[PDB]
Fold this protein.
Amino acid sequence: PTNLCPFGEVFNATTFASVYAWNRKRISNCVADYSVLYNSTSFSTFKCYGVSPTKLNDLCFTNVYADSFVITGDEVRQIAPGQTGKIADYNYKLPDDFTGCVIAWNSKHIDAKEGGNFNYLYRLFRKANLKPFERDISTEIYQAGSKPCNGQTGLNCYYPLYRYGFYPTDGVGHQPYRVVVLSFELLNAPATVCGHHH
Amino acid sequence: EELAKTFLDKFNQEAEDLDHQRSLAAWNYNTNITKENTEKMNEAEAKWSAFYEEQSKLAKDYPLQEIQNFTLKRQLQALQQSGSSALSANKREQLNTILNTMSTIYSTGKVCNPKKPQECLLLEPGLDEIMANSTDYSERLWVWEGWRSEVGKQLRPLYEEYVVLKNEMARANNYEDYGDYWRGDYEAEGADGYGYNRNQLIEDVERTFAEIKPLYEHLHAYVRAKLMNTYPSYISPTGCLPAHLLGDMWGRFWTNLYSLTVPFPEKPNIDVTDAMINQNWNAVRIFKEAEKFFVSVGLPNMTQGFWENSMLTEPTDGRKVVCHPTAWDLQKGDFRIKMCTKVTMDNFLTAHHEMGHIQYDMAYAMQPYLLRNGANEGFHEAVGEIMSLSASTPKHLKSIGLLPSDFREDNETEINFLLKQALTIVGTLPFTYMLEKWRWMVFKGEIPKDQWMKKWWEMKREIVGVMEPVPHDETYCDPAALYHVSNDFSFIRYYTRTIYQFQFQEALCQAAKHEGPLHKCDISNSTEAGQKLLNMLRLGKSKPWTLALENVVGARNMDVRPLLNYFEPLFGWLKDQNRNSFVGWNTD
Ligand SMILES: *[C@@H]1O[C@H](CO[C@@H]2O[C@@H](C)[C@@H](O)[C@@H](O)[C@@H]2O)[C@@H](O[C@@H]2O[C@H](CO)[C@@H](O[C@@H]3O[C@H](CO[C@H]4O[C@H](CO)[C@@H](O)[C@H](O)[C@@H]4O)[C@@H](O)[C@H](O)[C@@H]3O)[C@H](O)[C@H]2NC(C)=O)[C@H](O)[C@H]1NC(C)=O
Ligand SMILES: *[C@@H]1O[C@H](CO)[C@@H](O[C@@H]2O[C@H](CO)[C@@H](O)[C@H](O)[C@H]2NC(C)=O)[C@H](O)[C@H]1NC(C)=O
Ligand SMILES: *[C@@H]1O[C@H](CO)[C@@H](O)[C@H](O)[C@H]1NC(C)=O
Ligand SMILES: *[C@@H]1O[C@H](CO)[C@@H](O)[C@H](O)[C@H]1NC(C)=O
Ligand SMILES: *[C@@H]1O[C@H](CO)[C@@H](O)[C@H](O)[C@H]1NC(C)=O
Ligand SMILES: *[C@@H]1O[C@H](CO)[C@@H](O)[C@H](O)[C@H]1NC(C)=O
Ligand SMILES: [Cl-]
Ligand SMILES: [Zn+2]
């Protein structure tokens, strides 16, 4: 494999997906330098489960999937196997058998602005927790009670999406962070997403 | 089942998002006072009020006695009971017009020199100075009588209207009166020996005050003796202190009587303010030092935003600003302090106090919004003074800073220190209890409006041993001329804070293994004592305060004994000075 994996598009993308509406891309037949990923000090979080980053340059996988959204700094703990809370439960759930790498960096410079930036959303409520890698962009009215809702916001009937308000003055735990989850997939198939060393 | 919880998370997240926006609007005002910036506060202050009234009413949809998890029930009860001003449309807005008008008449007070009529002065910078620095009786009398004449009288009709609508509001929330509503803050349900009813409070306040009274009486006769040196022929040896002759504009603290009352003048003074001026301390460095204090007991450092977003220096922008110190929890991990901090020892000491509040805000953010608060209203001020107790000791001032370390610390300086303490701390206790005992009585109807001043001054004379220069009929509204009264703030907190301080510092110092006098205790370098305090802060309002108290001091109510122990040496000294004189006061 000669051509380069377009991880650069994923990471240097100017526009980034709201988290309930989280963006997935497949990276498929390409060779990558993962060093440019780990050998870099932009990344507040860089955790890997099932792989060790320094070896990713020897290793070929059949597919890599890049999921990317924005979340608050405190929530980056929720993007992990066996984790709970309104992000892990209602917007993005990684599976307990995950083999891959959560990567996150602080993005207050771009995703927060004076007066607030409200262009990002998230799902406070859901009837049930999500399935691993389940995406859900519904705007249906949450009903926890007995009396139904007719698209009616009221007693026990709440619109399921809320906006992030990102301000420059916000404490670090409530500032916007851009997140990127790489799943390294191993199928008994040929493997064409390879590290820099064959 | 309890769908209340699924309601609460919705409230929790909508609350902080707007309260964030309310805080930001307010802060932009306080640091930059514009017509535009004043207006934007009201828009956010409007939205937040509108937001609460619906949640209050929506909360009522959920019955509090179906809820078993006490933590969830406690939040629900706060929402349906507190702020539930479902009064009437023409009275939720008459009350607000009353509450702005009183707030700003006080803010805009100007009284004039009876001999220099065009010389008129605001309280916030100017008149405060005369009342902290002057020894000219007639000068203080007009500044005192003037403020009570010019602003107090304008506030009298408002207070009367304030009373009715507030009592109505509290009636609607199943409370006997606004006073009952206020005392409700100390109510706590656990049904396990940690329960506390509102009507225990006045019993426990009057119980502890009875224990404090001797000490106060002796501090009073001593201060009276030294003051007849400065005002012979105006102070009777056997009677009350004139109200215009104390530390400040009211008799609230006696701090600025120290110059006049210092037991041992000839001991070298302890005031470290010149050493900072010598050493080129500036605002930043003072807080960097208070940071070191907290770090040293194991609390966190400050946030980066605290440095960049705080206002420490009063601006030279010409930006006009409210210079009164405050510590802001703006809901988003955004903590700031707003202080015009000058390079003195007293500011150094308050910056330790006010960073105390920031630490308590940081400490409980792990809580749902409705529980981000101190276990009762007494706990936040107690937590900030705990800091000043340790950082004002000579032991502390030597180590980190510029007491000379060649400093002689003997029985004579210790009495000097305690007297300084008692003037500000023990002096305030009668002044504060007598004020809430008025308000409580006024809200309960025990005092007709035709005897408000008649019964205020009578109470002043009986309890604070303070009396008034000129006689005041019912056209004055003297209590309204303190900030907290005309800005609708509960006040007994400054009493309960005061007893808590010494309960904490005693148990905390015992965890730091300090030996000897409690008042020379400095907690610095004790991670053990810090963890002990850090546990309860974290709890926020999420458990009854009675349980929070015991998790530190191992007691479940106010105990005065630590305060008595702390001032024990000054007690023996004072009783000797007064030994063949009168201890008490006449009421004529
Ligand atoms: C507030 O204080 C914290 C706490 O710092 C500790 O406590 C203070 C009182 C001092 O004793 C410090 O010496 C203590 O470390 C500060 O956080 C620390 O900041 C320093 C930088 O000044 C960090 O040191 C660097 O860490 C780099 C690697 O970071 C990654 O790993 C750490 C540790 O596991 C992790 O915390 C972090 O999230 C990263 O994933 C490394 O490249 C470099 O060489 C150096 O080691 C130190 O790690 C921080 N500690 C913690 C616990 O975060 C804050 O800086 C301070 N804030 C302010 C505003 O002053
Ligand atoms: C990529 O980063 C790794 C660290 O994540 C670098 O190796 C480590 O960093 C120290 C630098 O202080 C090196 O001296 C050590 O070899 C490594 N540490 C340990 C504990 O083994 C690595 O050098 C970087 N990649 C390249 C190509 O330089
Ligand atoms: C774009 O992102 C890639 C991925 O790490 C990086 O290698 C590249 O340097 C980035 N482009 C820049 C910094 O101009
Ligand atoms: C105060 O508010 C006005 C309103 O526009 C603004 O122009 C000014 O810059 C503000 N001052 C500061 C210091 O931000
Ligand atoms: C109440 O709810 C909290 C929520 O975390 C839970 O931890 C606790 O166990 C529940 N029960 C009691 C008795 O507090
Ligand atoms: C804390 O430890 C240092 C270490 O020498 C010491 O000098 C300092 O005096 C200690 N703090 C106090 C308040 O004594
Ligand atoms: Cl008064
Ligand atoms: Zn305070």
The longest strand of chain B covers residues 116-122. The CA atoms of residues 24 and 330 of chain B lie 7 Å apart. Chain B touches chain A at residues 3, 6-7, 9-10, 13-14, 17, 20-21, 24, 58, 61, 303-305, 309, 330, 332-335 (CB under 8 Å).
